[PDB]
Design a protein around this ligand. Structure first.
Ligand code: A1IF9
Ligand code: 2TM
Ligand code: MG
Ligand code: MG
Ligand code: MG
Lengths: 29, 93, 158, 178, 46, 1091, 210
DNA sequence: CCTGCATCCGAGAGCTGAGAACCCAACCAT
DNA sequence: ATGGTTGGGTATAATGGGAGTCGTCTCGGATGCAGG
């Protein structure tokens, strides 16, 4: 539980702009 | 030193968060065969061999360069992981 | 940059500094041979005289280096921080000084020769005590320090 | 560049009737100076056959056309009564220093490759002295001193060096854009 | 090591232990020169 | 080259034989060649005389022993893996007490290993050395009480494992109490057993005051000595019935039995000299007429009381004084083990005597010899003092034979030894070298005998001194112990003399180790030579007086690790001891008598002596030493040459014309070079490699065995399935590689097939190894002298040789403690060169000098420059040799040669030389107002020359120290250390990678590496190290498959070591259970352990 | 004796020896026990060691790695690369080719150069007194058998060149490589964690020349 | 009855590399 | 049906063992002893 294994940082997500919008387009439905 | 390391260190509140983001982006790039990149062909990392210039096979370099471009969004609870994975398969077979 | 035997410049004042010391010693012996001094005080005065003489020799060596040979290799190395400290330079040029017996007490006669002049057999054997003691110090204290580091890791790892 | 000795399988052995072992014999042979009279010639194989008791030198090599030994007095081996020496020595042209593990030249199965030091120049010095010419002062006078082993004369080596330097200076004549 | 505020998640206990222990291993009472309650024992006592 | 030698001290006596500490000791212990009637009572004869006679009636009495001839020679023992030994026979007599029937028999008791001529042993085919052990001498000692000032403690100490230490102390109540076997009890009862009355104690101890009054006790005294004996027994053995005879036997065995208690001869001498008495035997008390009589107890009580009362003439004892510490050599240790074996033999003999028909009992039948072989073999194979002999070079073996160890059985422990026993004592002067000791945890515990020192018959080291009478130094030499040395005033060896009279009013001297200044009349003895203060290795360092002791230690140790070279040279500057070193190592060959050389060969020399007797010396050629170095002897004579007695015939390894040759003389420049000599790194020229300088030969031995298995025997053969002839090329028709074949990693050496219908179990070249096959040995069952292990049909050995050149990563060192790895090999045109075109060979960084304080290398470099231009070599003895003015004169001659060479040919001073001279004029190195030639000579006399840079041709802006240096190649070579592993064998239990390069193991990631990874916050890297790379079996399998298929490595699992921990905790009846977030059990065993 | 040998009285020993038998507690505890020898530290795969020499021409983020060392350390990636190319038809053939020294060719070295592009390795010198005893470097393939070390990291490693040896480790996954390149790279660690003062700084010859 | 004060026992003590009775008869296994 | 393996028997009288270990030093807790 330290560094990259810390709960403060290890759940971070990363995604581009293309995928992010269409995931909302699915939620917008 | 890695190029633009100060910029990357300043883009996050914790350096370990930067490491996590870079590693996850590299995994995403490796899974889809570099088809999901946000780099345009002229910014693609290149490697020099006897045969000629080719794409850089190292995914961590790709992820770091993409983070420099600033077209990637990172944070907490952005998208449920299952939906992200399904969409990643659908967009990139 | 190079090192030759002549680069360990021996100041002239050192000789004077020794001869003057050989004066004071006589006085001390007289002050003990007639009765105005005990044994402990005589030992302490001899030791203090020799340590002050060693300090004077060190000062003379470095003053000579600064005034006459500012580009001397040993002086340049010591001043720039590349290698060496004043004590080692003095041992090379001026004199080694007092040595300690294995029990921990100082000898009465010092090593008045530098490493350039060459030591005698007796002086070499006298210094062997301190050399061996330093080696043993390293060997048997590094373990205690490593133990302390492990204890600190097991108390602060969380 | 290569040596073959009869009834000898490797370099770490001895020959009966011979004072020196193979390692020392090869060390002696590395000092042999051979002059090729024909520029087109690339390799030669010298044959030596001797029987004790004698002092085998470089002059005992069998004569070969267009090949000269510049140091015939070089001592090779000492043989006692009953000792025999049968050698085939392969000598090549080349440049620089090539270790045996690099070229690995063997003619027969039992041949021993030898480290090759091809350079015929032993020593080079040059001296710059003060000179002048009328009103000009602080001018240079250059003196090159060359010691070779006799296979190539100092003048020939100097000419080849000048040719090499000129050829390398030629290379600055084809600009390319980056 | 970075001249900036510490990042959340840094294992500062291990860093502190190493920082205290490293100088004691070598430079405390390295080669001593025989020339003309203290040191490590005092630190361990404390 | 002409040899010039310095020094004015003339040595009266030569060095003693340097290996006599081993050879003489073992000869005295064995006494093999002495006729039995004149054998002394030492050695194994003493063991026989002490164990015998055996009484229990029947009596067995010892008469004599003899040693037969060895069954096999030394070379056969080395080749066939046998022990070089001699059979031991004992002549015994069985005697009936009443009948007088005599049965005489010669009994075979077994084999005793034989020491070779050089002083080593051949045990199971391996060369071994027994290291001498230093320990506290037996006797009576008096020490201050640490708890209570003014009180003293008396100690009686016997030989190790030959009795208990006995303590005497005056308690605060005044009652004297003696501790034995951890039992305080009053000594008065023992005094009563010894037969002492009130009056006797009062008369003998009346002077000393109240201590005797406090000792007195009437209750003990009123009793008879028998009652005191029983009371003592029941106090010492609570619970045991107090039988009179049982108590008598116990007390007799405790202090009075010569077969159990034994103060040595040294202990007897110490007791006699300390207590001022004469001892009848070697035990504390005598048993005669059914009564005990005292020998030591009253004198030690008297000394203790007189010490406590402050009577003059009684002092405390220094525990580390060399008069109180003694040396057990190989002979004494072997004799002790022999005595233990003889005790077992006698015990078995008594057991068999008390059994069986007395009429059918013969001497041969009673003796079972097996425990004797057990003891001797265990000593010579398993004792820590028995060590694998170090034979990197002859000096290595010579150093190993003169080692003194405080460790071993009955010695100190490495981890708990304090400063007191590791310190240089003042009595070490002339007996133990103060310099040569190993750095690390063994500092001060392993030391070396001084050059002139000799261990006496009692085990005390003695050193020689010249007798001086009336201020006149004589040639009489007296060898003295530390105790005898303490009584005199001893002058230094460098005391100036005119003829042999002390020509100095003030003389530096030692009195009990204290330096003093005395008048010549007060001088009693003089040192023989400075050489006697240091060991053999330290005596080979020229200008030692200009070196710091630590770097002198480093150089003395590193001289042992030097590797023999094919073109080895003796040093340009020597101390004058190399010839004796090479002679005493038995490495070279010398003429026995005057004669003429008849035959010279690479492996044989026939010499015709004046007596018409022809002697043939075979030459040892290309023999693998214990450390892999090749030792060969090369002839140095021709047919018809006249040889006098002692003349050299053949050079041994690391020898040049009878001088020790551990390295090469190279031209060095002391200057920085582009950072390639950064922090002790070394830069060398390719020209060294061109002339085969620093080239060594090394031999490796590979073993394979064909044995018997239950599923079918293994067979060495050429017929192996499933390989092409490209892998089968070099193996001969018997399946063994042919001599002369070059082998590379992966090549087959010996082919072997094992039943599975057969599979390949051949012997191949390990990675990073190879060379030329030079030897092959095949041993089968049944050949004479071969003793194979059961089940093993045959063994094949292959010896493969390599010729190693100097490469980047190899370690070089000089004799003054400067060491470094080669970091760059430059081409000849890039090296700095002299104005005449001569390039240097080595560039050394000056930054290693100022802090290490080893100025001897600089003076050696100056003298080497002088010798290089004058073409001569120098002998410079330590502390008495070349000084600066002599070196300046030699350099003046060298400069006249060096500049006349350039002047005769018509050359002046170079322009670059003029610019360097102007810069040096700024630096203050040359005096302004002189011609360029004068200033060049000025620089030369300081050991500096103008040097040109090979890259540019411009000079270095300052003059540079240039000269000849002797540098050796060390056995630490990068070829033997480079190792890497991807995957390989795993351990049986922990399922973790194996360790070591030989096992193709992996590096250990220990606790501190884990701490570093944690401090970096690299959680995932650490988890990979813990699981995917070490002991997560499914994890590592999946990781390898994923990498081979191009995917990313999967998530790790629980390591197998944790499962092992859980299983071992269950074995201790502890329920360790892993729980989930709801405290429900989680099965980490996948269900394989659930019923 | 089974649970805790050598606690009360004489420990149980095997006949013919004086060595005490190793009980369960002896297995569990001590410097040689399970906890300290197999759980808090392990031997690992993909590791090597060699002598170090000065690398004055290297950059701060680079280390000189021997060619054969790199061949053994990156063997699985190399097998994948050669199978992808036409060097070998399949992985087994590539392994058979790489198991014999004389069976190695020229193109495999180019494949190896392709494999390690951008990757880093971990260099470690014992004793690891602080965290800067392990550092990440980009490997430059060199000839010979010695690791080449940058002059400016020697003070952090407390390393010199009189016989020192170092260990090399290869982080495998993307996470491990990212951690090594971002957090443990030598060029990213210039100040001391203990004092905040520069630790990678000119020393010895560099100071002398300046 | 409390307290302090020697006394005894147990648990530590850096990292990496390498190195000795014999015989006779019944009885399961394969 | 054979070896290999296992159980039983011996009769003058015998009646409590034997190696060993003495050169660490501190530190902390448990404890028995002395005083009041
Ligand atoms: N962490 C660490 N680093 C060390 C150590 N000691 C040296 N270094 C480094 O190594 C450089 C060269 O040091 P050295 O110039 O001293 O050379 P060396 O390799 O140590 O060899 P030796 O001179 O000891 O020769 P040997 O024949 O006696 O070696 C055989 C005998 O040595 C001892 N021994 C040999 N090898 C090792 C080793 N790896 N570890 C521990 N003991 C070793 C041992 O007792 C063995 O039984 C130094 O600068 C340091 O960076 C150490 O203790 N720990
Ligand atoms: N047991 C050991 C012995 C050594 N080492 C390591 O080796 C280095 C050099 O010790 P060293 O004695 O080889 C030389 P150094 O003190 O630097 O030399 P100088 O004063 O003569 O110039 C130490 O600083 C430790 O990092 C270790 O970890 N464990
Ligand atoms: Mg060492
Ligand atoms: Mg070092
Ligand atoms: Mg250093």
């Amino acid at each position: 539980p330290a560094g990259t294994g810390s709960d403060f940082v290890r759940f971070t997500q990363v995604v581009d702009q293309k995928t992010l919008k269409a995931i909302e387009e699915a939620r917008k439905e | 030193a890695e190029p633009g390391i100060d910029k990357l260190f300043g883009m996050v509140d914790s350096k370990y968060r930067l490491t996590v983001v870079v590693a996850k982006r590299a995994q995403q790039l490796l899974r889809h065969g570099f088809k999901n990149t946000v780099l345009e062909p002229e910014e693609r990392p290149k490697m020099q061999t006897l045969e000629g210039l080719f794409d850089d096979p190292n995914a961590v370099t790709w992820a770091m360069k993409e983070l420099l471009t600033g077209r990637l969004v990172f944070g907490e609870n952005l998208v449920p992981e299952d939906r992200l994975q399904k969409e990643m398969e659908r967009l990139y077979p | 940059i190079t090192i030759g035997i002549d680069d360990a410049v021996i100041p002239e004042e050192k000789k004077q500094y020794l001869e003057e010391a050989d004066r004071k010693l006589l006085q001390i012996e007289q002050a003990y041979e007639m009765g105005f001094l005990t044994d402990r005080e005589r030992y302490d005065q001899i030791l203090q005289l020799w340590t002050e003489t060693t300090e004077k020799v060190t000062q003379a060596v470095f003053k000579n280096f600064e005034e006459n040979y500012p580009f001397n290799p040993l002086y340049v190395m010591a001043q720039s921080g590349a290698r060496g400290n004043p004590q080692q330079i003095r041992q090379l040029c001026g004199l080694r000084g007092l040595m300690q017996k294995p029990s921990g007490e100082t000898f009465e006669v010092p090593v008045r020769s530098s490493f350039r002049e060459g030591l005698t057999v007796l002086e070499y054997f006298i210094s062997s005590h301190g050399a061996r003691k330093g080696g043993a110090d390293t060997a048997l204290r590094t373990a205690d320090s490593g133990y302390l580091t492990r204890k600190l890791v097991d108390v602060t790892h969380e | 560049t290569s040596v073959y000795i009869e009834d000898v399988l490797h370099e770490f052995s001895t020959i009966p009737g011979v004072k020196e072992d193979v390692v020392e014999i090869i060390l002696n042979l590395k000092e042999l100076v051979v002059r090729f009279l024909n520029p087109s010639l690339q390799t030669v194989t010298l044959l030596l056959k001797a029987e004790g008791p004698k002092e085998v030198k470089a002059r005992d090599f069998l004569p070969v056309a267009d090949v000269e030994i510049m140091n015939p007095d070089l001592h090779i081996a000492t043989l006692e009564e009953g000792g025999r020496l049968n050698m085939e020595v392969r000598v090549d042209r080349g440049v620089g220093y090539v270790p045996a593990e690099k070229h690995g030249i063997k003619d027969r199965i039992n041949a021993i490759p030898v480290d090759a030091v091809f350079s015929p120049v032993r020593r080079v010095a040059f001296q710059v002295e003060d000179t002048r010419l009328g009103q000009r002062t602080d001018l240079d006078k250059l003196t090159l001193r060359i010691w070779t082993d006799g296979s190539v004369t100092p003048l020939e080596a100097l000419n080849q060096a000048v040719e090499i330097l000129r050829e390398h200076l030629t290379y600055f004549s084809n600009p390319q854009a980056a | 090591s970075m001249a900036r505020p510490v990042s959340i998640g840094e294992a500062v206990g291990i860093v502190a232990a190493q920082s205290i222990g490293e100088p004691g291993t070598q430079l405390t009472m390295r080669t001593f020169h025989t020339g003309g309650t203290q040191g490590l024992p005092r630190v361990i006592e404390l | 080259m002409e040899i010039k030698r310095f020094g004015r001290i003339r040595e009266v006596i030569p060095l003693p034989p340097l290996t006599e500490i081993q050879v003489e000791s073992y000869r005295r212990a064995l006494q093999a060649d002495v006729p039995p009637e004149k054998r002394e009572n030492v050695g194994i004869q003493a063991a026989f005389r002490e164990t015998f006679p055996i009484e229990e009636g029947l009596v067995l009495d010892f008469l004599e022993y003899r040693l037969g001839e060895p069954p096999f020679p030394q070379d056969e023992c080395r080749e066939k893996d046998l022990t070089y030994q001699a059979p031991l026979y004992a002549r015994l007599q069985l005697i009936h007490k009443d009948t007088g029937l005599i049965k005489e028999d010669e009994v075979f008791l077994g084999h005793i290993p034989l020491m070779t001529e050089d002083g080593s042993f051949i045990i199971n085919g391996a060369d071994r050395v027994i290291v001498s052990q230093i320990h506290r001498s037996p006797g009576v000692y008096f020490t201050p009480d640490p708890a209570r000032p003014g009180r003293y403690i008396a100690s009686i100490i016997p030989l190790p494992k030959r009795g208990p230490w006995i303590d005497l102390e005056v308690e605060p109540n005044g009652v004297v109490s003696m501790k034995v076997n951890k039992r305080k009890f009053p000594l008065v009862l023992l005094l009563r057993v010894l037969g002492y009355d009130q009056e006797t104690l009062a008369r003998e101890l009346g002077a000393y005051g109240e201590l005797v009054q406090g000792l007195m006790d009437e209750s003990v005294f009123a009793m008879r000595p028998e009652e005191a004996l029983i009371r003592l027994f029941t106090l010492l053995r609570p619970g045991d019935p107090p039988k009179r005879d049982k108590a008598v036997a116990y007390v007799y065995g405790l202090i009075a039995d010569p077969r159990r208690y034994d103060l040595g001869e040294a202990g007897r001498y110490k007791a006699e000299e300390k207590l001022g008495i004469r001892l009848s035997g070697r035990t504390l008390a005598r048993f005669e007429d059914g009564e005990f009589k005292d020998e030591v107890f009253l004198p030690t009580l008297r000394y203790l009381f007189a010490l406590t009362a402050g009577v003059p003439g009684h002092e405390v004892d220094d525990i580390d004084h060399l008069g109180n510490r003694r040396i057990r050599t190989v002979g004494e240790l072997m004799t002790d083990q022999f005595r233990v074996g003889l005790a077992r033999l006698a015990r078995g003999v008594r057991e068999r005597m008390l059994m069986g028909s007395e009429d059918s009992l013969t001497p041969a039948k009673l003796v079972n010899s097996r425990p004797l072989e057990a003891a001797i073999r265990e000593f010579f194979s398993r004792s820590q003092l028995s060590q694998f002999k170090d034979e990197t070079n002859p000096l290595s073996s010579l150093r190993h034979k003169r080692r003194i160890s405080a460790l071993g059985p009955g010695g100190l422990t490495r981890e708990r030894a304090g400063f007191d026993v590791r310190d240089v004592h003042r009595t070490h002067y002339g007996r133990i070298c103060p310099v040569e000791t190993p750095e690390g945890a063994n500092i001060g515990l392993i030391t070396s005998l001084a050059a002139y020192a000799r261990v006496d018959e009692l085990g005390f080291i003695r050193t020689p001194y010249r007798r001086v009478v009336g201020g006149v130094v004589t040639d009489e030499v007296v060898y003295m112990t530390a105790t005898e040395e303490d009584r005199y005033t001893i002058a230094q060896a460098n005391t100036p003399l005119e003829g042999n009279r002390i020509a100095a009013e003030r003389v530096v001297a030692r009195r009990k180790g204290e330096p003093v200044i005395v008048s010549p009349e007060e001088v009693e003895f003089m040192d023989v030579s400075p050489k006697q203060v240091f060991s053999v290795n330290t005596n080979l360092i020229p200008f030692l007086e200009h070196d710091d002791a630590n770097r002198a230690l480093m150089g003395s140790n590193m001289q042992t690790q030097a590797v023999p070279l094919i073109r080895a040279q003796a040093p340009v500057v020597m101390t004058g001891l190399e010839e004796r070193v090479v002679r005493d190592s038995l490495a070279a060959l010398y003429a026995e008598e005057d004669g003429e050389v008849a035959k010279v060969d690479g492996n044989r020399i026939v010499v015709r002596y004046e007596d018409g007797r022809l002697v043939e010396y075979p030459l040892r050629r290309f023999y693998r030493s214990n450390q892999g170095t090749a030792l060969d002897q090369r002839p140095r004579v021709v047919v018809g040459q006249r040889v006098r007695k002692g003349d050299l015939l053949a050079d041994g390894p690391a020898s040049e014309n009878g001088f020790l040759a551990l390295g090469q003389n190279v031209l060095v420049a002391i200057m920085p070079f582009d950072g390639y000599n950064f922090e002790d790194a070394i830069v060398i020229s390719e020209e060294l490699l061109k002339r085969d300088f620093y080239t060594s030969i090394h031999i490796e031995r590979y073993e394979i065995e064909a044995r018997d298995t239950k599923l079918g025997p293994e067979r060495i053969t050429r017929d192996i399935p499933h390989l092409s002839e490209a892998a089968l090329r070099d193996l001969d028709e018997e399946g063994v590689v042919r001599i002369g074949a070059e082998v590379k990693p992966g090549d087959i050496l010996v082919g072997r097939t094992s039943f599975k219908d057969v599979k390949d179990t051949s012997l191949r070249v390990p990675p990073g190894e190879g060379g030329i096959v030079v030897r092959t040995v095949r041993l089968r069952r049944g050949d004479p002298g071969v003793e194979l292990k059961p089940g093993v049909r045959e063994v094949v050995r292959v010896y493969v040789a390599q010729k190693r050149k100097l490469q980047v990563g190899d370690k070089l060192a000089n004799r003054h403690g400067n060491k470094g790895v080669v970091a760059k090999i430059l081409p000849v045109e890039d090296m700095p060169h002299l104005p005449d075109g001569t390039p240097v060979d080595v560039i050394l960084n000056p930054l290693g000098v100022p802090s290490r304080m080893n100025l001897g290398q600089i003076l050696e470099t100056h003298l080497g420059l002088a010798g290089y231009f004058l073409g001569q070599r120098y002998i410079s003895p330590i502390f008495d040799g070349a000084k600066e003015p002599e070196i300046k004169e030699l350099l003046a001659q060298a400069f006249e040669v060096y500049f006349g060479k350039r002047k005769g040919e018509g050359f002046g001073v170079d322009k670059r030389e003029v610019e360097v001279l102007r810069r040096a004029e700024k630096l203050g190195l040359v005096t302004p107002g002189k011609t360029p030639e004068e200033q060049l000579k000025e620089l030369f006399l300081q050991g500096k020359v103008v040097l040109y840079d090979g890259r540019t041709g411009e000079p270095i802006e300052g003059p540079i120290v240039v000269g000849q240096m002797f540098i050796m190649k060390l056995y630490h070579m990068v070829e033997d250390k480079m190792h890497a592993r991807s995957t390989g064998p795993y351990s049986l239990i922990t399922q973790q990678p194996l360790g070591g390069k030989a096992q193709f193991g992996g590096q250990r990631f220990g606790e501190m590496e884990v701490w570093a990874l944690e401090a970096y916050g690299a959680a995932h890297t650490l988890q990979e190290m813990l699981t995917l790379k070490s002991d997560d079996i499914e994890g590592r399998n999946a990781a390898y498959e994923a990498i081979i298929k191009g995917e990313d490595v999967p998530e790790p699992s629980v390591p197998e070591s944790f499962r092992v921990l859980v299983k071992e905790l269950q074995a201790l009846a502890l329920d360790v259970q892993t729980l989930d977030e709801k405290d429900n059990p989680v099965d980490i065993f996948e269900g394989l352990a659930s019923k | 004796a089974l649970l805790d040998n050598g606690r009360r009285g004489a420990p149980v020993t095997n006949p013919g020896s004086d060595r005490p038998l190793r009980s369960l507690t002896d297995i569990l505890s001590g410097k040689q026990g399970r906890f300290r020898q197999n759980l808090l530290g392990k031997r690992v795969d993909y590791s090597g060691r060699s002598v170090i020499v000065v690398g004055p021409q290297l950059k701060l983020h680079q280390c000189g790695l021997p060619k054969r060392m790199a061949l053994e350390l990156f063997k699985p990636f190399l097998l994948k690369k050669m199978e992808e190319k036409g060097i070998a038809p399949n992985v087994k053939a590539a392994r058979r080719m790489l198991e014999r020294q004389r069976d190695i060719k020229d193109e495999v070295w180019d494949a190896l150069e392709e494999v390690i592009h951008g990757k880093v390795v971990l260099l470690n010198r014992a004793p690891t007194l602080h965290r800067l005893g392990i550092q990440a470097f980009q490997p430059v393939l060199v000839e010979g058998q010695s690791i080449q070390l940058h002059p400016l990291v020697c003070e952090a490693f407390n390393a010199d060149f009189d016989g020192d040896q170092m260990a090399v480790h290869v982080p495998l996954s993307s996470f491990a490589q990212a951690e090594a390149r971002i957090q443990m790279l030598s060029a990213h660690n210039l100040l001391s964690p203990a004092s905040g003062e520069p630790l990678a700084k000119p020393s010895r010859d560099i100071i002398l020349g300046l």
